[PDB]
Design a protein around this nucleic acid. Sequence first.
DNA 1: TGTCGCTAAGTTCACGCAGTATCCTGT
Lengths: 186, 868
Amino acid sequence: ISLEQIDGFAAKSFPLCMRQLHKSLRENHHLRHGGRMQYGLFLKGIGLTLEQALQFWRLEFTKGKVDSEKFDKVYAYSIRHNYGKEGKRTDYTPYSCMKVILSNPPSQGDYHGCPFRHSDPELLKQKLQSFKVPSSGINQILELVKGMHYQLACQKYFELTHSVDDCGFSLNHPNQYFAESQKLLT
Amino acid sequence: QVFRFYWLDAYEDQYSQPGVVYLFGKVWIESADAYVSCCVSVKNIERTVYLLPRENRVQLSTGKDTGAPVSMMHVYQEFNEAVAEKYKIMKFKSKKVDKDYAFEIPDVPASSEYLEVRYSADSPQLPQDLKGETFSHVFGTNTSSLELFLLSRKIKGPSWLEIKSPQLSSQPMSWCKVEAVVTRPDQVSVVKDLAPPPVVVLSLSMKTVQNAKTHQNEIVAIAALVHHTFPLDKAPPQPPFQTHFCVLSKLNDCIFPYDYNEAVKQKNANIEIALTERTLLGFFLAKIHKIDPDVIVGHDIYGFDLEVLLQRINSCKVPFWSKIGRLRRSVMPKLGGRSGFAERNAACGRIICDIEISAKELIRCKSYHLSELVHQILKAERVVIPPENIRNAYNDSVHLLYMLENTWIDAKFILQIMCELNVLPLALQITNIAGNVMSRTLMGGRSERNEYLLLHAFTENNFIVPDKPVAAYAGGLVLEPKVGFYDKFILLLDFNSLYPSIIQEYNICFTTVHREADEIPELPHSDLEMGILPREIRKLVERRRHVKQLMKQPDLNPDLYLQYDIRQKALKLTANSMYGCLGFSYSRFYAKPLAALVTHQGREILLHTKEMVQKMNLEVIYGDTDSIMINTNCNNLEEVFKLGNRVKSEINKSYKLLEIDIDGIFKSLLLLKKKKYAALTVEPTGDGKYVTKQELKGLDIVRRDWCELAKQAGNYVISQILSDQPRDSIVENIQKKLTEIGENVTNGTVPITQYEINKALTKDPQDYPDKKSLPHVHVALWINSQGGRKVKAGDTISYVICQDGSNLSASQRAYAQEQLQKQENLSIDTQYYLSQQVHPVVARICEPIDGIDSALIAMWLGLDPSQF
DNA sequence: TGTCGCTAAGTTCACGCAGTATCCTGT
Ligand SMILES: Nc1nc2c(ncn2[C@H]2C[C@H](O)[C@@H](COP(=O)(O)OP(=O)(O)OP(=O)(O)O)O2)c(=O)[nH]1
Ligand code: SF4
Ligand SMILES: [Mg+2]
Ligand SMILES: [Mg+2]
């Protein structure tokens, strides 16, 4: 996989959680630890190799007005660990949507977590409207969110965005979302 | 009809026999042409209580004061009708006594007409808070019978007493050879101007083996040396001991080596072989009765010897336990408890001398074990039998006799120590000065003696003493010192007994200080006549001054000089303790304001003295609450002495009693910090000749918490730094010696004994909170775990820091020297000793000396200068 | 069952404050 195409995926393939994380990262060129962990694990899942991820994170963080050597000093170790290169050397699996829902609860200044669960109904409505989703689709997604079935809401999002009547799969992993989107598109 | 006897000990039982006080002593008999022990039982010691009349009638504290006057007749009526009936009191005798009061109770008029009421001891006792409509307080309610008899009859310490109309006892009550009965306290008086008589002194030493199965102690050998005429008003007799008796008991399991009979026969017939501990204890009791000792002495006798003997008697049920005292009883006092009061009463009538406690009171030593005391006073060598060797001693008759002779030598050492320190005459003199009982004086502690001294001083002077009770204030001032080294002559002036002198000068007396129940009370008016406390303090100061002046007599034997020095130190400590008891919160005469006043006046006098010395255009460098050090800027000795005399006269011109003296002259001074310096004292000899003696005050080389390696190193370093050699040669010598000691330590040339570090426990090993494993505490616990004599509180424990691969913090690795010599997996901690034990000492010593710094010391010692 | 006072330097430990380094989480 290429670094350049990541943005394209962010436009289309990325689930709304990753879309929000990528938007925040490109807005501020810096992510708190939770966002870093979540996005890094996702980019590991899509296939971004250790070198590719290292280059991407270096380039993105250097723009945050920090020393490049500071990056190699601090975040390089975190990256290596995220890829199971040091320490116990375990190939840590990407976060599942259930974990994201039940993981660290985001607070002010955070952007991680499942938007369907961690976004207020008005904010989710505004975001869905921004993405040109049909009003009926936005209402259905909001109803599903109010029903606590956030996975069904994401499935409805996938159905609406991919112009498919039925998703055909039980969405239980953001990487599964990306794989299904790639299968439909490519 | 008169019966004259010299009394030593008094024993009382506030529960068994009420209102009965026994006095034990010696009496002359012509038939035997000797002094024999006797016990006179003063009976019918009526309780006394002083009732304070009120100013006006009070309606049982309900209606408050009513204004109705109350007289003595009304008080008598009230006590006869209400109190007497209420408390079941049948017969009492009343009188009016005008007395003055000055102690810690409010709204008690200074001088009032109390109503004294006496009633028999057997009748119930009034309560402390008892109040009525006519009186506001009852005193002397709990005054013990012994205290009442002593104070009322004016007896002060051991003396000769005369008894009128003695009555023979109906049945034996005591184990002595003469018994008398006194029917009233008024029949006993004191006769003056007579010579104290000789006493019988028995020093005992017991070797015991701890039972393996029962984890207890079983005595195996007991030896005693008795002198039948040990005087108490002359020098100790030579030879110290006149006769002796030894007894040895075969172990319950081990058997004699088929030669004990022949060995004993060829050795002597003065030793008793006992088949069991029972027979041994019976023989001991019989011998004690026959000798009838008056002063039984030993090492840790209060702590471990007498308690062990009594417990063993109880365990083996040896009949006639009462013989271990002088009285006749059947129920032994309950064992255990804190201190040795129970053990003291377990041998009532026989003074007990624990050389350990006496040595603690008088002399100061690094350790108080028998070996250290023997090595420090008599200058001998004490052989310590390993505890295993004792259990295995009963395998060869040679080793059995060796153990017995070791016990005998320990006994002789104890007796010689007692004689050398002059424990008994000094105790008798202090007891006579204070007024308490000798048995209590020999038990240590200063609060009791001061309490009894003031008790006598106030009772004899028509006062009512308070009832026995059922950082705090500003203290000394230390001037900021100008740390450094000085080569010219430094003159040290000091005051003579500053606190007693302050008390005398400013009339700080119980009857003058207008108290009010943390301010500083105002100074008493000058016009007031001398009080009670100033009078007693002045008597003690006069005795000390006379003893000092007597010491000044030229051509005195060195031993007599040592005796005089010890006595003078004891007298100074007694005066200081009389001051201190004013600050004890548990004292009968707690007077925190009085102690605060004394200390405040001491600080004021020191500050004023500093101001005066400074105004004389000299330099002040130090002072600790009564002393001042002055810089001379001169070299000739005569000029130094002239300046000293001038300043002494100028300072003394302003005080009515206080005296300033030339505490010393210093050739070279090394002032490290507050309360830490070294100097070369200069002693003149004649014709301008002056010898030098090295004196260290406060250094780390004079404390028992540093290794002997560091002690010797610092001693040499200070010796060099104080001498007159040029600086360069001094530095070169220091460098060479430090390198030499480093090489020696790294090569292990230094011996083991130079590594020990000593620390004294405050509580028992267990009671210490488990706050890590502080070296000493750790080692103590180990010692208790092993099968040996326990290490209780107030004991010096020696530990050596070693290495075993523990990789723990160095403190936790503290081990025992015997362990290191025994274990094959432990070794000395070379880096610790050469890093944290030597380097800090020398660095503090050489702090103000130019040319040496921590890095240089570390490098020279051989240590790595990385972390330094 | 009583065991004198205060003052002061000094050791060993327990913690703030800041700085450096390594090691984490999941399916
Ligand atoms: N309470 C109490 N105070 C003490 C003790 N030792 C010293 N002091 C205080 C009170 C003393 O008045 C003051 C003076 O101490 P010194 O060692 O100079 O002895 P002192 O002046 O009494 O006599 P001296 O210097 O030998 O002529 O220190 C003590 O053991 N207990
Ligand atoms: S359901 Fe999963 S993929 Fe969809 S927004 Fe939530 S966390 Fe992201
Ligand atoms: Mg951070
Ligand atoms: Mg003095």
